Amino acid sequence: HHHEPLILTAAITGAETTRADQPNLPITPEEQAKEAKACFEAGARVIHLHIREDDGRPSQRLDRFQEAISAIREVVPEIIIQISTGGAVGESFDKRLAPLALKPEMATLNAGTLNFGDDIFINHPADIIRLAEAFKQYNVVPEVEVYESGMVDAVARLIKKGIITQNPLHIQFVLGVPGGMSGKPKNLMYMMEHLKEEIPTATWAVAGIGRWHIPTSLIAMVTGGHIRCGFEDNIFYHKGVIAESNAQLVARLARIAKEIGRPLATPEQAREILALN
Amino acid sequence: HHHEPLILTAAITGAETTRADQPNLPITPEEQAKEAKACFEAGARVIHLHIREDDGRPSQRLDRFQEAISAIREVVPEIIIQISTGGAVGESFDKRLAPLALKPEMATLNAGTLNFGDDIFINHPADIIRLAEAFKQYNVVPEVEVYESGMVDAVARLIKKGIITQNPLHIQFVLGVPGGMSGKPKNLMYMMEHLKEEIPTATWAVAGIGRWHIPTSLIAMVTGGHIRCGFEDNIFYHKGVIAESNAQLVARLARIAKEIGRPLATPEQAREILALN
Amino acid sequence: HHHEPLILTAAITGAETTRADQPNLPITPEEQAKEAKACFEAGARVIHLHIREDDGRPSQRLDRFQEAISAIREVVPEIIIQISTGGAVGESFDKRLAPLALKPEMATLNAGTLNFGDDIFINHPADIIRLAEAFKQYNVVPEVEVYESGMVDAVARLIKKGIITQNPLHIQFVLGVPGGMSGKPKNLMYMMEHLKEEIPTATWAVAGIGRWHIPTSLIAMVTGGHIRCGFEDNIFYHKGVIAESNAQLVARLARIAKEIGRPLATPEQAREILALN
Amino acid sequence: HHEPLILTAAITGAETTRADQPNLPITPEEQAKEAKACFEAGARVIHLHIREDDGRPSQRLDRFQEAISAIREVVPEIIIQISTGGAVGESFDKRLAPLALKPEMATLNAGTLNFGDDIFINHPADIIRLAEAFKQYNVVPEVEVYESGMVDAVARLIKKGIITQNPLHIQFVLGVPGGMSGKPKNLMYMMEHLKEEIPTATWAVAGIGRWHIPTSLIAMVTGGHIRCGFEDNIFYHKGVIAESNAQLVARLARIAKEIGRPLATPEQAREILALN
Numbered sequence A, B, C: 001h002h003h004e005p006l007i008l009t010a011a012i013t014g015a016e017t018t019r020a021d022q023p024n025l026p027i028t029p030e031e032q033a034k035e036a037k038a039c040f041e042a043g044a045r046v047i048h049l050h051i052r053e054d055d056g057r058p059s060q061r062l063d064r065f066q067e068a069i070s071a072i073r074e075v076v077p078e079i080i081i082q083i084s085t086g087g088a089v090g091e092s093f094d095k096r097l098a099p100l101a102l103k104p105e106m107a108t109l110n111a112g113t114l115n116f117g118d119d120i121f122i123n124h125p126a127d128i129i130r131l132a133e134a135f136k137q138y139n140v141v142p143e144v145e146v147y148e149s150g151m152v153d154a155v156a157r158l159i160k161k162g163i164i165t166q167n168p169l170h171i172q173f174v175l176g177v178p179g180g181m182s183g184k185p186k187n188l189m190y191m192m193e194h195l196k197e198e199i200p201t202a203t204w205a206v207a208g209i210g211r212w213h214i215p216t217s218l219i220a221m222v223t224g225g226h227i228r229c230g231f232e233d234n235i236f237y238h239k240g241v242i243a244e245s246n247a248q249l250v251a252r253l254a255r256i257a258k259e260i261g262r263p264l265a266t267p268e269q270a271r272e273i274l275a276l277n
Numbered sequence D: 001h002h003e004p005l006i007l008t009a010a011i012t013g014a015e016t017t018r019a020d021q022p023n024l025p026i027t028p029e030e031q032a033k034e035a036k037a038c039f040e041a042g043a044r045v046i047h048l049h050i051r052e053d054d055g056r057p058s059q060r061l062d063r064f065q066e067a068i069s070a071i072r073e074v075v076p077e078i079i080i081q082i083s084t085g086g087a088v089g090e091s092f093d094k095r096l097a098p099l100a101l102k103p104e105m106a107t108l109n110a111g112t113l114n115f116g117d118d119i120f121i122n123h124p125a126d127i128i129r130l131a132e133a134f135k136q137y138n139v140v141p142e143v144e145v146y147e148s149g150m151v152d153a154v155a156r157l158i159k160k161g162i163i164t165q166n167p168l169h170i171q172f173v174l175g176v177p178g179g180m181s182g183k184p185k186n187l188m189y190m191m192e193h194l195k196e197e198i199p200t201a202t203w204a205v206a207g208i209g210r211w212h213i214p215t216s217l218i219a220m221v222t223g224g225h226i227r228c229g230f231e232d233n234i235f236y237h238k239g240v241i242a243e244s245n246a247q248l249v250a251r252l253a254r255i256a257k258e259i260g261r262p263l264a265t266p267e268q269a270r271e272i273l274a275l276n
């Protein structure tokens, strides 16, 4: 339904994107804060946050996460800061889990292992359980990341076992990873229906990597889904035309939502939908 | 694919819409010409044409069709004028077929019978064959209208029997009629896949009646489909806000196509895709 | 789920099938009673009944329907006798409605109009309402016949208007009619999912005409659906091999259900599922 | 439901235990006896894992040769497909080496996934190494797919010329805890997804545990081929342990006979799977 409020998430930095490809990539807490302000003004209500060292290397340092979180909340106190527990491929699970200790409002929870480009993004079943238990210990709301159909079933089993008790649960379909399910329209339609069958009360969002950004976004617009965009997932505005800011990508989605009459969620509505109150 | 040229059709008048509900409805040839020019400038490449008497009653008069066609050609000679052979529900089949004698570039060919609101839109199998023979007699390219899954199979059988020889064939999915298949995303995805299985070389467009205009349009945008809009099908710009003009509906679709980088077909490209050149 | 009880319906005679193609076709009430007993023993719990005159002509005579109903009830009182309100294409709606006055446990209710072979099977919206009101008047439970996606929506609107109050409602997908939706696996999967979305509490069965009998039956077996078989819909046991009787077609489905461990509904369970108690 | 049906019997596997399934064939002679009964019941392919006498999964070349020779002797016409999957946690080097035995066919796992409490690892560089060995040893692969994304990954290996097999045989392995389930919606989605991404590919389905019956009956009427057996499912009915792999094969053959779908002859199975 294209009248339910739309939540836009900006995945502004990520762990893979470089300035070789996207020179406008925000790397420092100050750059991330400036980008978060422009994204919030463009319509984003959530920042999906990865941090980097000054040299651009991915980081898991708690004091660096605090620096970025502080800089963003000082410029836009209303935005929801969602910490990544995914980090860079190959990072140790202990370093990935530890920032839950900063007690953010929300953080991601990756629901399975998959080949990821030339490497493997590992989420051992015992570590998924350890992380789900840590979400309860640190009192953080999860965004559950799903890259394949089978990950929805795996999450439904963790719900049945009482390991994931978050209700309503927010699921993010991450489509277009080389090794994961693509963002073709048939796949997004299949995933939302599959999720409705297996976890009927779950809410959902979609992140369309690269070329899949536009097809996933426009389908989510008219099916009641929420949308993630940003340099972490896609650096192009048009084929061969880099976007000049994460805010440009957010603003296009907000303009399309305005065209079709789908309202953007207020910060209050975004916290209500995602059960962050 | 959202890189293939987009053909926008404006169904500007129709047989059911009234001036009482939509005061901006073009009824006279002069009003239809003014609307067609504004629609073409907004991005439309096809006008789906029904005619009316000055009092708003649906008409099948050949002089009135000639007047509307000439008035539109006078101000926008590049637009494709597609005559309706559907007309008003209950109209005699003889009166529905006769305007093909005007040798338009294109005309609609309804592929089956269905309950339509409180009445029945009748297309007897023998009359569908008579109409297909008249299209060939007057060298008119059809737009085959389908309202249900079974109409695709019925068209595939007419192709197998050598009754429909148009190649490539252009199919329009008309979704949202009370009595026909709705325009929900699941249905449009099903129909394009069903059509690919049964008539692999067919091209397609979608008309989303009323509330289905936005979901059908945005799915067609990113799946390579073409789109029909207009007062015949939908009088609202937003929920509860009746639109200013057909051009206002066309312009929104053109702006969304520009946002996502899907080019609008030139008149030459539209004629090539629809095999009118 | 392939463990919920399976209801088998035998459509033993119909209005189209001839003795010239199928010499085992039961035509008289005595032949229909003998067939119904053999079908019940093979696993059928419902008889879908059309009647014929002694010369094989389709009939709508109430005395002839009473004779067939009484003959079947005398030899197999546990079977559910479902009378057809569809009859032969082109029959008057008054003659089609009249047998509801015999107060059968169940009867079919055709939910829309469609081209049917070279003719049109007409179900005017006002007549569908008249029929649905007559079902309630005579305390007859309907089996709602749907041939296309749009007919599910039309039934959902009759439920919303309080015209169809039957809860749970039993829908039968009639697939493979020339002019209607085919019985290909994609279509049956689409229809059960479409029905779950639009009428969530409805139960369903499938009738796969001719070549579609086996694909529809095996999909329904493992998706919790119920199945109709019989000479009305298909006269062949294998491609080009005429069946010996309706009981032969029923027995195969019962054997497949036994193989996979799906229990056959007892007469008591069939009446509970179809809300005939 | 008229195109010939190929039935594969996955008779042993690496996970199933004798305690849960006392009829589990473990030794080459037990595997040969089972393969003969399966062939007579309608199987045209044996999906083979080997075990040591103590039931532990094995990768020993002499043990694979013993099992292959024993099966070959009792049923020469059956297609022996060796597993390159082996047991979860087995080294990739040990998993690849049996291709040197030049079997008629072997499995090629197309991706990594969580698998029960562990992870079934197929590193992208190892998938490439394995696909290259298939070409060098002139072995026809059966490509194992557990998720939608693995179809796309296989399409990319075809584009890169790493997989040159044409037509390519894909097996959907559905119902693994961690992988895509075998519900009817999923099998319908996968066959359509495969037709879109690899149009000339043929396919089979393996429905683990509770998914055996739904996957089998959908494949029966959609032209797909079917895998059954103790590796994937030990029950004949819910809570009723199966008596042999041949019992599971025979049920599928009886259902195929009921609906008039012919079973592939050994010659037809080799033609469809391009083993000639």
Ligand SMILES: C[C@H](N)CC(=O)CC(=O)O
Pocket (backbone or CB within 6 Å): A014, A015, A016, A084, A085, A086, A087, A088, A089, A108, A109, A110, A116, A121, A145
């Ligand atoms: C492998 C990806 N960099 C992990 C990721 O970005 C998902 C998350 O943020 O939780």
Ligand SMILES: C[C@H](N)CC(=O)CC(=O)O
Pocket (backbone or CB within 6 Å): B014, B015, B016, B084, B085, B086, B087, B088, B089, B108, B109, B110, B116, B121, B145
């Ligand atoms: C019954 C419909 N008003 C006929 C119609 O509008 C379709 C067409 O133009 O061909």
Ligand SMILES: C[C@H](N)CC(=O)CC(=O)O
Pocket (backbone or CB within 6 Å): C014, C015, C084, C085, C086, C087, C088, C089, C108, C109, C110, C121, C145
């Ligand atoms: C026109 C159809 N032969 C009528 C029919 O057989 C459907 C029903 O029984 O309700």
Ligand SMILES: C[C@H](N)CC(=O)CC(=O)O
Pocket (backbone or CB within 6 Å): D013, D014, D015, D083, D084, D085, D086, D087, D088, D107, D108, D109, D115, D120, D144
């Ligand atoms: C993890 C499974 N035991 C590996 C397997 O059985 C797949 C194959 O045979 O190629």
Ligand SMILES: [Mg+2]
Pocket (backbone or CB within 6 Å): B063, B064, B067
């Ligand atoms: Mg005049």
Ligand SMILES: [Zn+2]
Pocket (backbone or CB within 6 Å): A011, A014, A048, A050, A084, A086, A087, A232
């Ligand atoms: Zn991330």
Ligand SMILES: [Zn+2]
Pocket (backbone or CB within 6 Å): B011, B014, B015, B048, B050, B084, B086, B087, B232
């Ligand atoms: Zn029209």
Ligand SMILES: [Zn+2]
Pocket (backbone or CB within 6 Å): C011, C014, C048, C050, C084, C086, C087, C232
């Ligand atoms: Zn009938």
Ligand SMILES: [Zn+2]
Pocket (backbone or CB within 6 Å): D010, D013, D014, D047, D049, D083, D085, D086, D231
């Ligand atoms: Zn295996």
